[PDB]
Design a protein around this ligand. Structure first.
Ligand SMILES: *[C@@H]1O[C@H](CO)[C@@H](O[C@@H]2O[C@H](CO)[C@@H](O[C@@H]3O[C@H](CO)[C@@H](O)[C@H](O)[C@@H]3O)[C@H](O)[C@H]2NC(C)=O)[C@H](O)[C@H]1NC(C)=O
Ligand SMILES: *[C@@H]1O[C@H](CO)[C@@H](O[C@@H]2O[C@H](CO)[C@@H](O[C@@H]3O[C@H](CO)[C@@H](O)[C@H](O)[C@@H]3O)[C@H](O)[C@H]2NC(C)=O)[C@H](O)[C@H]1NC(C)=O
Ligand SMILES: *[C@@H]1O[C@H](CO[C@@H]2O[C@@H](C)[C@@H](O)[C@@H](O)[C@@H]2O)[C@@H](O[C@@H]2O[C@H](CO)[C@@H](O)[C@H](O)[C@H]2NC(C)=O)[C@H](O)[C@H]1NC(C)=O
Ligand SMILES: *[C@@H]1O[C@H](CO[C@@H]2O[C@@H](C)[C@@H](O)[C@@H](O)[C@@H]2O)[C@@H](O[C@@H]2O[C@H](CO)[C@@H](O)[C@H](O)[C@H]2NC(C)=O)[C@H](O)[C@H]1NC(C)=O
Ligand SMILES: *[C@@H]1O[C@H](CO)[C@@H](O[C@@H]2O[C@H](CO)[C@@H](O)[C@H](O)[C@H]2NC(C)=O)[C@H](O)[C@H]1NC(C)=O
Ligand SMILES: *[C@@H]1O[C@H](CO)[C@@H](O[C@@H]2O[C@H](CO)[C@@H](O)[C@H](O)[C@H]2NC(C)=O)[C@H](O)[C@H]1NC(C)=O
Ligand SMILES: *[C@@H]1O[C@H](CO)[C@@H](O[C@@H]2O[C@H](CO)[C@@H](O)[C@H](O)[C@H]2NC(C)=O)[C@H](O)[C@H]1NC(C)=O
Ligand SMILES: *[C@@H]1O[C@H](CO)[C@@H](O)[C@H](O)[C@H]1NC(C)=O
Ligand SMILES: *[C@@H]1O[C@H](CO)[C@@H](O)[C@H](O)[C@H]1NC(C)=O
Ligand SMILES: *[C@@H]1O[C@H](CO)[C@@H](O)[C@H](O)[C@H]1NC(C)=O
Ligand SMILES: *[C@@H]1O[C@H](CO)[C@@H](O)[C@H](O)[C@H]1NC(C)=O
Ligand SMILES: [Zn+2]
Lengths: 707, 192
């Protein structure tokens, strides 16, 4: 036999056994998740151990089949999957150390607390802090939570992230990658003839191209939100500047969904909600899933198996069992499909049921593929397929046909604007976030951004790309990106960017086939078997073909295209454009603390000559201490107040290599309270003589601009 | 069918026999049927009709993407139907001939009330098959016809209120065209 023939036999045997072992693991995991106890946890761990031992043995064996001698692309692809080394390229000490670091970062994140600075006995966990950030409209409360999280947790992760980056890059190099960023970008890499090849470097060019196409829409949404927040927080937001990071609706500014109550276009009109009708008509969990099944059948896709309806958990157990309700779709192997969900009779769970069943439909479609190829074409394909099914099901058109919405229910254009705006806050307002975050991490792994400039570049990029400005200047003891779940837990993020773009390409292509006329957001592909067939042809491919091929099969293109997204939100764009006028855009010069900051310029050479010293970190510390002193003296003598100002209450920003920087002072017990510039300038003059002596400087070599 | 002014596409007439006898008043330029043959028509009866141009008969046909069937009038073909496009001098029959022909070329919704009313071309108002155009779209065609303007653009409301009691505004465009046949009324009929 030849190498290819031997590889053929190897894979056939592997795939057969892999299915058997994978099934046993899946069953044990299921039993645990639907019945949480110690006995099931033990069975789960044992089943996973057996799977891992199996996979590793065959991974090593796969190394005996050189890819250079394989001409069959199906075989070559499966071998490439098995032959990956990963962490095993590291020595035992480095492999163990990396594992330890990853565990540590995860633990710090999940157990972090922030304590109210004016109430030491009131401490919240991340879940509590998130709950507050999603609802609070209090400028001060939001600020100490935002800053607290970054200081309490971010400063613990900083040193771990630095070691993490070094270790992950060494691993990537051991696997013949340039760096860990290059490693991650390999998830979009494909090879083949025609234009079906996609290099890792091309991913960077495509996300930059797409971002620029989206940007004009984001700027209109940004300007609109800014105008509304200026009313919610008077005198806090500048009409031509960036938005304060802590006022964006959540802990990180990832979604703008929670701003809807402040930004809603037409407040006298409500969105469609059929929850009350579902209850009135006596709907239950079973009926909801049965209706989802009918939807998929109307377009020529499968029914759920007899087993599905028996094995699945569609409602929360009433028998005492503890479960995790978070909705998931399962493929256990051997034609065993299940959904685990705690369904309520609501519109939200109605749409969720369609989403989860969409995942099952995809899993069934490629069940005929070899075990290793039973996946989506890319990491974003499964989610894109699920989302388009939810969009269709949620239309007024569909709801009327179901009897959940009055047949004579009138159309209202203001309601449609409210709908599109709410969608934009979740879909559009997040794209610059995902783009900016990955761009930063890629540059950090590559080495374009040195450790000394990690936070400097983070916030520079935030202002230029997203249009968000920090409430307070942060130095390099901070690690703001690590305060996010996905960064701390070593997950890739770009998948969210690509998922969104694909989602709209699929929706538009299917609506054209279904001969939909009018606005895209009102499209419903129900009863279209032509649209169904076009989709099925893509779904059944699994990952046996290049994703560019899979995309062409549905959207008739080999490239990602932002136009479908821009078309979806076209009516919103036009409305916003007319309303915003020429107020669209932002500068990156303004910040919440810039108006009352004082610029200091020092010349040590002209002061001391040969006796001149270096303005190092220790000199900066002394300066801040000297300012705090001046502030204590001023307040005690002028206001008759005793205020314990410390060096830590003196904030320093915009520091250059030359001795030039700006500073401002806050109250010891209040971070939203910035001491007026006039009070600070008065304090400096009063103690100017002592500040001078401290550094051996005169009034020409130590200049306070404005004095 | 031969009395008064001839109805326009946006205000078509609706009225609910010797088929040959009727087809002796008009000179037929084109004729077509769907789900039926004219022999069967001769061997309820509903007649829908409006002023149109014979020069533009291609737009009356099934599969057309013209403005007529988007904003003015569209058949359902649920029942056996025949299309007739023909012309005659109606004055001698007790009616009157039109001096020009008017149709809606666009109509779309508007959000908000004055002075903050914003009209969006992205929210088109299409006529449903078997139905008349909205009162606010029909208003535009009427004013356009009588304006003496080849292209007439307006924003109107016509006793249409929303869920909170506010006026519903619509914007659209009407187009007026000259007759193609000298001293004759050009008509389109949909008979089902
Ligand atoms: C997909 O296509 C099917 C088949 O045409 C649609 O089902 C149909 O739904 C309509 C109402 O939406 C049914 O007509 C009406 O049914 C009610 C009873 O619920 C009755 O009281 C009315 O007098 C009238 O007959 C129609 O009979 C029914 N056709 C069937 C079941 O064969 C379905 O609604 C379409 N779904 C979508 C999203 O378009
Ligand atoms: C198409 O034919 C119609 C007739 O069916 C023409 O309508 C006529 O248009 C003139 C303006 O060109 C109207 O005269 C104006 O009436 C108003 C209101 O009384 C008055 O304020 C003006 O000073 C002027 O006299 C005329 O009344 C109107 N006829 C009818 C019956 O309303 C229409 O102009 C023709 N369209 C085109 C493009 O030729
Ligand atoms: C993957 O790494 C192996 C070497 O690592 C050993 O085998 C792994 C499967 C794992 O068990 C490690 O802990 C082991 O230390 C590579 O095999 C070597 O390849 C070179 C050519 O570059 C060859 O000269 C050596 O003789 C090979 N050594 C052995 C034992 O086969 C393998 O090529 C790597 N595969 C990839 C895709 O990088
Ligand atoms: C989707 O529509 C096409 C084309 O229909 C025409 O153009 C449309 C935009 C619209 O204006 C229609 O009213 C027009 O009639 C359909 O393609 C036709 O299919 C029939 C078979 O049923 C065939 O005899 C025709 O020759 C086709 N016409 C062309 C130009 O190819 C298509 O079938 C429609 N899709 C569905 C699911 O109905
Ligand atoms: C946005 O406004 C809605 C009300 O329109 C808020 O929803 C209400 O929240 C309270 C408190 O939890 C509930 O008691 C009400 O029953 C809810 N009403 C509805 C219709 O859901 C919503 O919480 C607000 N969101 C934010 C971020 O403020
Ligand atoms: C698919 O492979 C071809 C090579 O056959 C790539 O084409 C090269 O692209 C680079 C970068 O633009 C150019 O500098 C080369 O000159 C091109 N070579 C040829 C022969 O055209 C192509 O870019 C790859 N496609 C993708 C998406 O990566
Ligand atoms: C910290 O300082 C801020 C000022 O930045 C205080 O803010 C005030 O809050 C009250 C509400 O109780 C408002 O009436 C004032 O107008 C706010 N001042 C300003 C300038 O906006 C805040 O109360 C302080 N927090 C404390 C002392 O806990
Ligand atoms: C690749 O091998 C599979 C069997 O594993 C076979 O079905 C397929 O036709 C082969 N394709 C080519 C191009 O040889
Ligand atoms: C859906 O289920 C019904 C009832 O068992 C069955 O008759 C029908 O053929 C199924 N649909 C498809 C496409 O097989
Ligand atoms: C559902 O699964 C249980 C457990 O295997 C089995 O005993 C029961 O008979 C099944 N019911 C149906 C309808 O298949
Ligand atoms: C009337 O016609 C003129 C052109 O002569 C045009 O500019 C004007 O807008 C028209 N009036 C309306 C209401 O459209
Ligand atoms: Zn999902």
């Amino acid at each position: 036999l030849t190498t290819e023939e031997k590889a053929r036999e190897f894979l056939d045997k592997f795939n057969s056994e892999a299915e058997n072992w994978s099934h046993e693991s899946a069953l044990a995991s299921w039993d645990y998740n639907t019945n949480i106890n110690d006995k099931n946890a033990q069975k789960m761990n044992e089943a996973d151990s057996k799977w891992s031992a199996f996979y590793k043995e065959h991974s090593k064996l796969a190394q005996g089949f050189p890819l250079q001698e394989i001409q069959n692309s199906t075989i070559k692809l499966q071998l490439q999957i098995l032959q990956q080394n990963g962490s095993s390229v590291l020595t035992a000490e480095k492999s163990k150390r990396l594992s330890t670091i990853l565990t540590t970062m995860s633990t710090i994140y999940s157990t972090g607390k922030v304590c109210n600075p004016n109430n030491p006995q009131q401490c919240f966990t991340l879940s509590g802090l998130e709950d507050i950030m999603e609802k609070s409209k209090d400028y001060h409360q939001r600020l100490w939570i935002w800053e607290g999280w970054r200081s309490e947790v971010g400063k613990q992760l900083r040193p771990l992230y630095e070691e993490y980056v070094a270790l992950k890059n060494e691993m990537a190099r051991g696997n013949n990658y340039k760096d860990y960023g290059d490693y991650w970008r390999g998830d979009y890499e494909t090879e083949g003839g025609d234009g079906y090849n996609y290099s890792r470097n091309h991913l960077i060019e495509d996300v930059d191209r797409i971002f620029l196409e989206i940007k004009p829409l984001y700027e209109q949404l940004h300007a609109y939100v800014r105008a509304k927040l200026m009313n919610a927080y008077p005198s806090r937001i500048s009409p031509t500047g960036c938005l304060p990071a802590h006022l964006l609706g959540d802990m990180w500014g990832r979604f703008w969904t929670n701003l809807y109550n402040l930004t809603v276009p037409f407040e006298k009109k409500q969105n469609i909600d059929v929850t009350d009708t579902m209850k009135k008509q006596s709907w239950d969990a079973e009926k909801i899933f049965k209706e989802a099944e009918k939807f998929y059948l109307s377009v020529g896709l499968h029914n759920m198996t007899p087993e599905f309806w028996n094995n699945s958990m569609l409602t929360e157990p009433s028998d005492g069992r503890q479960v995790v309700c978070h909705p998931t779709a399962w493929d256990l192997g051997k034609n065993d499909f299940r959904i685990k969900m705690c369904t309520k009779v609501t519109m939200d769970d109605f749409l969720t049921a369609h989403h989860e069943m969409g995942h099952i439909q995809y899993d069934m479609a490629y069940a005929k593929q070899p075990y290793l190829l039973r996946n989506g074409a890319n990491e974003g394909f499964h989610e894109a397929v699920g989302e388009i099914m939810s969009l269709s099901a949620a239309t007024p058109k569909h709801l009327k046909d179901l009897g959940l919405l009055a047949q004579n229910y009138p159309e209202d254009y203001e309601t449609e604007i409210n709908f599109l705006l709410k969608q934009a806050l979740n879909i559009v307002g997040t794209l610059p976030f995902t783009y900016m975050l990955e761009k930063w991490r890629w540059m950090v792994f590559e080495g374009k951004i040195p450790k000394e400039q990690w936070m400097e570049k983070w916030w520079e990029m935030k202002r230029e790309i997203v249009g968000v400005v920090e409430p307070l200047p942060h130095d390099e003891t901070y690690c703001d990106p690590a305060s996010l779940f996905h960064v701390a837990n070593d997950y890739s993020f770009i998948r969210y960017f690509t998922r969104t773009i694909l989602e709209f390409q699929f929706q538009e292509a299917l609506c054209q086939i279904a001969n939909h006329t009018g606005p895209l957001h009102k499209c419903d592909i129900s009863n279209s078997t032509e649209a169904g067939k076009q989709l099925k042809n893509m779904l059944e491919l699994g990952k046996s073909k290049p994703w560019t091929f899979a995309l062409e099969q549905i959207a008739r293109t080999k490239e990602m295209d932002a136009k479908p997204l821009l078309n979806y939100f076209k009516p919103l764009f036009s409305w916003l454009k007319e309303l915003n006028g020429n107020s669209v855009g932002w500068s990156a010069d303004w910040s919440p603390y810039s108006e009352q900051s004082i610029k200091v310029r020092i010349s040590l050479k002209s002061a001391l000559g040969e006796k001149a010293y270096e303005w190092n970190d220790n000199e900066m510390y002394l300066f801040r201490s000297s300012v705090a002193y001046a502030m204590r003296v001023y307040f005690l003598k002028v206001k008759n107040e005793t205020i314990p100002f410390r060096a830590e209450d003196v904030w320093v920003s915009d520091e250059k290599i030359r001795v030039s920087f700006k500073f401002f002072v806050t109250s010891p017990t209040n971070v939203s309270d910035i001491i007026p510039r006039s009070e600070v300038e008065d304090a400096i003059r009063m103690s100017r003589g002592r500040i001078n002596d401290a550094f051996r400087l005169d009034d020409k070599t130590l200049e306070f601009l404005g004095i | 069918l031969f009395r008064g002014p001839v109805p326009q596409p946006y205000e078509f007439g609706r009225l609910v026999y010797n088929f040959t006898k009727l087809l002796s008043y008009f000179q037929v330029d084109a004729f077509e049927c769907k789900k039926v043959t004219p022999e069967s028509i001769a061997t309820s009866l509903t007649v829908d009709w409006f002023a149109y141009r014979v020069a533009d008969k291609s737009d009356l046909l099934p599969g057309s993407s013209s403005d007529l069937q988007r904003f003015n009038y569209k058949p359902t073909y649920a029942h056996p139907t025949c299309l007739i496009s023909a012309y005659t001098d109606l004055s001698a029959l007790g009616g009157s001939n039109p001096t020009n022909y008017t149709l809606l070329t666009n109509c779309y919704g508007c959000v908000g009330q004055p002075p903050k009313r914003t009209c969006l071309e992205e929210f088109p108002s299409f006529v449903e098959a078997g139905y008349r155009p909205k009162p606010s779209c029909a208003r535009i065609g009427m004013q356009g016809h009588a304006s003496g303007n080849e292209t007439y653009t307006a924003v109107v409301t016509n006793n249409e209120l929303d869920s909170v009691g506010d006026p519903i505004w619509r914007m659209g465009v009407a187009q007026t065209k000259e007759p193609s046949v000298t001293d004759k009324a050009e008509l389109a009929f949909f008979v089902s």
